[PDB]
């Protein structure tokens, strides 16, 4: 039987092999499974049940070792170095929160979520108790809803007749355990106080109506510590807002309902028309809250100085961008951004670079990529939400060269897992829906609690190990 020379190596701190064990002969036809079983065995790592993947020259093994050597035109006596890593636990389907209309946005309140941590300050916001996590959904019907994890609605925002949104909501987030922000087609951002009584009953009351945008407000990011909000609008502008009455300035009267050309109505701290096409995303720098990044259908990622409104830097990518997310990396002040495009791929960028590559592409979605959420567990993975009806999980540790079909420039990373729309998967059909028909994903968030995704099938879907 044919053999292959293998050297094992790893970056997992707890899983180092003793030196005499690292170099080994294995059957040439062994695959990931067999290699994984070897590491778990008693004579090796003795971990028993840990699924491993293997990096060879920077990309995951997905074949037998014999085939890897064949496909790369290597000698039979080639020694392969296999960097083993812990693989992602599959996030399988758990539950659906049924809605009457399309779900445009989802967010999660847990002790470890951003709003939970901002609440842990305990500075007028109560800490999130374990077991009492909350899920926020926003709908095209114009209403916000708060769910417990078991899937009961605890609270629903008031209608347009009672101080609520007067048109479809496009975006929403928790600032803290008792404060939320939302935005949509009525050109407003609303700030809400949330109170809960007997754990199954709650109330959302508007505290601010924020005016400034002259088109749909399609995306929002929040900072619950400083009580600030960033918006991106179809008007091509980036908005910067205080979420507190003590700091929100007076509004442009010409934008108010009833204007001829009771919640407090206020304007922005800043409103900057920096994009020549719809602005689609705006986020705080995770490490420096005076810095923001925006993305737009005009193909650019811009870096903003929030103290001045100045565009500090402009990257021009090759396609319209529909989404932006920051990855936080140990040892580095500058994030790595994921930018989801209208051309179905995701581009990874360092916002402090020249436009011309100064490059990694995430390929696999069959439609627009409109939502992104970094893994809460580490710094090399994230989940994307797409109008193709899927959410895809990516591992950036794995990158292969691009093929000519992919422009032959840069590295390409493929998904490690695909989360199907359960409403379609439970049909037991092989034909996926074309053009996201009835199943577009509009929003995904990845919490320790799980991966939550909402869209056109009118459900928040819950996936987790």
């Amino acid at each position: 039987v044919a053999q292959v020379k293998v050297i094992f190596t790893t970056t997992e701190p707890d899983l180092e092999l003793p030196e005499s064990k690292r170099q080994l002969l294995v059957p040439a036809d062994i695959r990931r499974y067999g290699l994984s079983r070897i590491l778990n065995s008693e004579s090796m790592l003795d971990t028993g049940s840990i699924p491993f993947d293997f990096l060879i020259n920077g990309s995951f093994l997905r074949s037998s070792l014999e085939d890897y050597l064949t496909s790369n035109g290597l000698s039979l006596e080639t020694t392969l170095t296999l960097q083993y890593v812990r693989s992602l636990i599959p996030p399988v389907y758990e539950a659906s929160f049924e809605h009457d209309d399309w779900v445009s946005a989802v967010d999660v309140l847990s002790a470890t979520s951003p709003a939970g941590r901002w609440s842990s300050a305990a500075n007028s916001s109560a800490a999130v108790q374990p077991g009492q996590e909350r899920v926020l959904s926003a709908s095209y019907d114009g209403l916000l809803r708060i769910w417990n994890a078991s899937g009961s609605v605890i609270a629903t925002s008031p209608s347009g007749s009672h101080g609520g949104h007067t048109a479809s909501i496009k975006a929403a987030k928790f600032l803290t355990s008792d404060r939320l922000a939302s935005a949509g087609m009525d050109r407003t951002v609303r700030v809400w106080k949330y109170t809960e009584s007997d754990h199954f009953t709650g109330e959302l009351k508007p505290t601010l109506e924020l005016y400034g945008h002259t088109g749909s407000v399609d995306w929002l990011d929040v900072d619950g510590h400083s009580k600030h909000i960033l918006t991106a609008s179809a008007d091509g502008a980036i908005g910067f807002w205080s979420a507190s009455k003590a700091s929100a300035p007076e509004p442009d009267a010409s934008l108010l309902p009833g204007a001829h050309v009771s919640t407090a109505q206020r304007g922005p701290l800043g409103l900057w028309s920096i994009h020549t096409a719809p602005a689609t995303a705006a986020i705080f720098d995770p490490r420096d809250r005076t810095v923001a990044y925006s993305a737009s259908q005009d193909h650019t990622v811009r870096t903003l100085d929030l103290t001045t409104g100045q565009v500090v830097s402009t990257l021009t990518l090759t396609h319209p961008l529909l989404s932006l997310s920051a990855l936080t990396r140990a040892g580095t002040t500058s994030p790595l951004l994921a930018a989801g495009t209208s051309a179905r791929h995701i581009t990874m960028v360092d916002p402090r670079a020249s436009s011309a590559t100064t490059v990694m592409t995430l390929r696999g979605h069959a439609n627009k990529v409109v939502s992104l959420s970094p893994s809460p567990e580490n710094e090399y993975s994230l989940v994307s939400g797409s109008h193709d009806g899927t959410c895809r999980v990516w591992d950036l540790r794995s990158v292969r060269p691009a093929t000519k079909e992919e422009g032959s420039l840069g590295g390409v990373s493929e998904p490690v897992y695909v989360i199907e729309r359960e409403s379609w998967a439970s049909k037991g059909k092989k034909k996926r829906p074309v053009a996201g028909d009835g199943c577009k994903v509009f929003s995904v968030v990845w919490d320790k609690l799980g991966i939550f995704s909402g869209g056109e099938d009118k459900k928040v879907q819950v996936n987790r190990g």
Binding site: A167, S216, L256, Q297, N367, H387, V434
Partner: protein, 352 residues
């Protein structure tokens, strides 16, 4: 030149617009590129969020009449949509996130500024409530609408009109004139010129090019088709693409000759619509009753002495052929290599 070297161009279906009952007759993307307008057999005009397929606004103009065409006033400082059903042209301000109090006010002003060839009237309480401000009535059913680029004039064409078939309407004056009563045959559709005071009128077998400030006729065009269905004018102003029921697509270089510079036959059934990209991309498309759109690269060189480079790059399939009708109308995004199509199957579709 291979299609590889000719990127970008649309290749896949990405959004479907569902809601019309019966055929979708017309599609038009707004001047800012965020909203789609559609017209239907069901007599509704619908406005949609372009990327998601969300219907955001609709109105039923007339219960008994199909909306044959929808076309936006091509100015970004207003939000005005024109729609033809039977004998009438309706001008309206759809309810849309971009319509601020100021933008609404501006738009109302443009429409009200004006306050039998054409009868200009307010459309009545029910329609006024929904944001329809003008109703213009002509003699014969409109099958085509074309705006002048500055938004003060729009032309309507009525095939069975006989001799008030082509009308030109001045919005500011609430005035419908019917010049060009001189003509060879039956009028199909018309269009203003992107850069000059010219006006094109397509008969069943020729396209007559005219002059507006002077008076009448500077050029004929001879596609050589048995029956013209549609045409469109390149943004440069020197070239035309012409579709026909005869299943042939023609490119006319207006300078070089009055007969086709290039002839393309790719469709097994009638061509119903053609359209140039207007934003600078060297693209155009046609739409056929075989249920497909063909996309072409069409590049007009800077050097006059050289000839246009025309290359087919993609066939877009996805629409359903229903009782021998397929794709009825097409439009391009103002800036991106994206197009929308209207289907006999009751859908519009976005391609990217």
């Amino acid at each position: 030149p291979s299609p590889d070297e000719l990127k970008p161009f649309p290749t896949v279906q990405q959004t479907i617009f569902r809601g019309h009952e019966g055929r979708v007759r017309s599609v038009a993307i707004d001047p800012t590129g965020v909203a789609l307008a559609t017209g239907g057999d069901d007599g509704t005009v619908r406005v949609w969020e372009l990327l998601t397929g969300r219907q955001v606004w609709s109105v039923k103009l007339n219960g008994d009449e199909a909306v044959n065409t929808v076309r936006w006033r091509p100015t970004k400082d207003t939000f005005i949509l024109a729609a033809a059903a039977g004998e009438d042209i309706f001008l309206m301000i759809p309810t849309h996130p971009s319509v601020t109090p100021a933008l609404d006010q501006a738009s109302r002003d443009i429409l009200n500024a004006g306050f039998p060839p054409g009868k200009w009237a307010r459309p009545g309480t029910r329609l006024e409530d929904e944001g329809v401000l003008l109703r213009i009535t002509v003699r014969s059913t409109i099958k085509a609408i074309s705006w002048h680029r500055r938004g003060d004039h729009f032309a309507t064409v009525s095939p069975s009109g006989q001799r008030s078939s082509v009308a030109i309407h001045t919005l500011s004056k609430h005035l419908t004139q019917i010049p060009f009563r001189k003509l060879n045959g039956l009028a199909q559709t018309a269009s203003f010129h992107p850069l000059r005071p010219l006006f094109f009128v397509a008969t069943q077998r020729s396209i007559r090019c005219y002059d507006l400030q002077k008076l009448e006729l500077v050029k004929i065009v001879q596609p050589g088709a048995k029956w013209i269905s549609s045409f469109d004018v390149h943004p440069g102003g020197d070239n035309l693409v012409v579709g026909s029921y005869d299943k042939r697509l023609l490119w006319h270089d207006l300078d070089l000759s009055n007969r086709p510079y290039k002839t393309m036959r790719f469709h097994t059934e009638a061509i119903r619509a053609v359209r140039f990209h207007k934003g600078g991309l060297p693209l155009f498309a046609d739409a056929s009753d075989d249920g497909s759109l063909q996309i072409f690269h069409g590049k007009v060189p800077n050097d006059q002495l050289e000839n246009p480079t025309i290359v087919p790059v993609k066939m877009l399939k996805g629409h359903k052929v229903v009782n021998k009708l397929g794709v009825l109308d097409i439009d391009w995004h103002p800036r991106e290599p994206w197009c929308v199509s209207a289907g006999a199957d009751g859908t519009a579709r976005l391609w990217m």
